[PDB]
Subunit: 256 residues, 4 copies
Amino acid sequence: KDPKAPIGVFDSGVGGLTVLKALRRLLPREEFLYFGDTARVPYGGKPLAMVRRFAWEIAGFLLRQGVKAIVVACNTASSAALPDLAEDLSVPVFGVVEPAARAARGFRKVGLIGTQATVESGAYPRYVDLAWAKACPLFVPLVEEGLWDDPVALLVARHYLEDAPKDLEALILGCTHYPFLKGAIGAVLPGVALLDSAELTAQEVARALEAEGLLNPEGRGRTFHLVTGDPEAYRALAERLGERVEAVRRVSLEEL
Amino acid sequence: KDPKAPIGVFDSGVGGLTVLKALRRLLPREEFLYFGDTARVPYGGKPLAMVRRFAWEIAGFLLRQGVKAIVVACNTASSAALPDLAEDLSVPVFGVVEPAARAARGFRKVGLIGTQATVESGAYPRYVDLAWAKACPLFVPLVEEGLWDDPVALLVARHYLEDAPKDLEALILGCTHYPFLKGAIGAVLPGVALLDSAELTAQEVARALEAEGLLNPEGRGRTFHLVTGDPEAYRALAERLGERVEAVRRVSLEEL
Amino acid sequence: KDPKAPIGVFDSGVGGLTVLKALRRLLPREEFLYFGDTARVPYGGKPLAMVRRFAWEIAGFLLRQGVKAIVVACNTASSAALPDLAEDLSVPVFGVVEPAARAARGFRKVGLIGTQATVESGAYPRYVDLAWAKACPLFVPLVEEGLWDDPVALLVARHYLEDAPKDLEALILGCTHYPFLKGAIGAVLPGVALLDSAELTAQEVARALEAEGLLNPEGRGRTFHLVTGDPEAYRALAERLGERVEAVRRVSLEEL
Amino acid sequence: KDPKAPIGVFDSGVGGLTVLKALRRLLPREEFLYFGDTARVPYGGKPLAMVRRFAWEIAGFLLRQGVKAIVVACNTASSAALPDLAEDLSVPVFGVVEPAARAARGFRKVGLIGTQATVESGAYPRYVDLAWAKACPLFVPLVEEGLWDDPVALLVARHYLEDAPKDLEALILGCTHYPFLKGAIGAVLPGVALLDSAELTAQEVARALEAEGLLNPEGRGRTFHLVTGDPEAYRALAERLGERVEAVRRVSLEEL
């Protein structure tokens, strides 16, 4: 156990940067390795079992790099791979399903939105009873196009959420990209608590790591980006989502 | 050369079905082998060289199934892989770039819409001079979500097409999915001639195969579907676009 | 923990059956999964980092079959992957390098033979001080061709072992196949103790698994064989070295 | 066609250098790209269909480097991939099976030796009627260990060619490596004509290439080596077999 060692964070691409941001705020002294698998993004439409192999390869790559814990920022990969991945690895492994589904248990009727893979996996029903679940394929490309406040978002939010229970008290945003869309989602489902996977998970990570004596007390934390697709494209994309990408290098899928 | 043998048509997923339909209308006596690489869709944001390897892998698989010709129904893969793929292979190879550009050469000011990869590839500039070109990433998810007749489609067309020159006489629909948004594109840009990649390629295919004595003068045509991801998801998506998918089988990326 | 779960054992091919037989004797009630990577055999000429990815891939595969412990029967793959693989996984992980090196420390001057990769790795010098090491590439094929009792084996043993120190007291048989060549090796190196990787490891596995309470207590144990190459070829090659294979199925490299 | 373009030659490893050497002696002004797939050597124990994907992949790679012709120096790979590879590609494609079988048709009772995959392909029987065929697995490592002049080479030659008919007039040396064993093979089978795949193929390539008007008339020939395994290990092994490797670099299997 070396608290000077970095924390691994991985995603299919830029969406998981919402998780990275929340982690860095609570843990400014830590070193993060953010792995964006942009050569194979998106996971949301791939067979769950293929994502599970992706997650295993990427966990292996992060351990090779020496991380002390792994945060699976993707909801699709969390659904596909956890809890087994945490049950198979020695370093702590954290996901974005359980923390938000835990908080959700203090409400009478809970709904879920996420990718096609996420809602069909049954990952969330394993931790919490769901009144309603619905795949929102367009949210991700709406967010990546920078249209989170544009009227089209709103109409699309209405198309996906029109048919949903009026007594829902909370809604799980079971996709890394969905925090950008609280505005259009709040507007169509007023009064409903919106559960953010990123903030809920980073808190869990911070609590658990300190509890194990693995947080780094001293020093000034940094972030390195590792992507399997084009780095310049990723840098552009990350910026459209308000993240200044400083350090990026391309990781070959042969290194996997 | 054996005219009883089938025609290979391949795409990243369901989009290339527009090409498949135009072909089946002109050549009802041909057997088609339609390959949808849904395990690795989309191509439009991947590195152009990676798509080139995809095209070569699938081209080889189709040659091992016995096809007498190959239609590359994806605009991204055509940009990535043609003309070399046709130069390197003995069977006739056709793409969806050159026929639409060729028709485009009979207007004075010509514009292009397509995927990210396509507009950046320079493939279309090779064949016709372009006044304006714009990637339309939301269009593909809009079509796959079944919303081409919804007013959000009308709004998205405006977000992408407003700031294109008023003196366009023609617009190249440089993506397999765009013939579905012909109404919305036509409304936001009245008067401009819309060039359909699928209709113009199918004609080029039929003309040339005829010229070579390769058409199958007798018998009833059949279509077989071959995909790399989940077949049942594929069939659902295909049916939302108007193809009743009769035969579908899953092909391993190990077979490539 | 679940003591009904099987034990995973993996190798590049049939060599690891020497380790499996030793395991069978000490643990007749245990259910075993033997994973033979015959699509990618042999490991001895490949880069150590490539083998290391193989070990990770297969370890992940065995975990998905539910194994409660993993034995790395290949000496080349132990050299590539241990001790990190054991440090990184929750289940007990055992190799064929450490146990023979432990026993070898009760000798004054010790030598090592094995594959090209094993000798270059420096895996063995990390556990025991070595007086001599020689790669013996032809020894593996001699065993698989069934020539271990034949004179040509004896001349080949002399060719590799001529310039070995006359005062050696022990020789590490650092390759799964080398137990078949004890006759020819002792003839060229009389009076030298031959340290058998397979016999020592099964004891360690048995001791360690007994201690963790993971030993199965009821039941007749079988072995299931999983291979990445042609199963019938594997079946025929295993029989030539004295193993009767009953259950063998081909596992695709894409499941990895 | 471009006559300044290089000729492509590929093999699993160093065995194909016998073919390269013969080629360079006949075509000293030609530029050659030698591709040795040392990350996946040997082919002889693999499923023939897997080798066939290898041939396709590497052929695509060489076409992307711009070769004007391809020589498949491996007898296993010719058996797996020819004649189809030659039918499906525009560049001239040459193998090592057909030329040696053609010369063999000038004899009454003809034998063949080679790898397990080569004799099991039945590729040689498509071109010449065979009286006798034997796989000789140990010949390849004998050559790679530098033991072709050693007496085990005489003993091993005798082991594999003992039941061979005494009325056999010719033997096809159906493996790239076996010309180094001409000495032992002729000694153990006196009076039998030995048909060398390498010398006969180069003749055919030079004949065919001049006829297509593709020879490069000006220039000093060089060879560049491309390997998928470790380049220094390859260079060492090429030096043991008498080839002086000037330029070698490693190509990733993901580039394939």
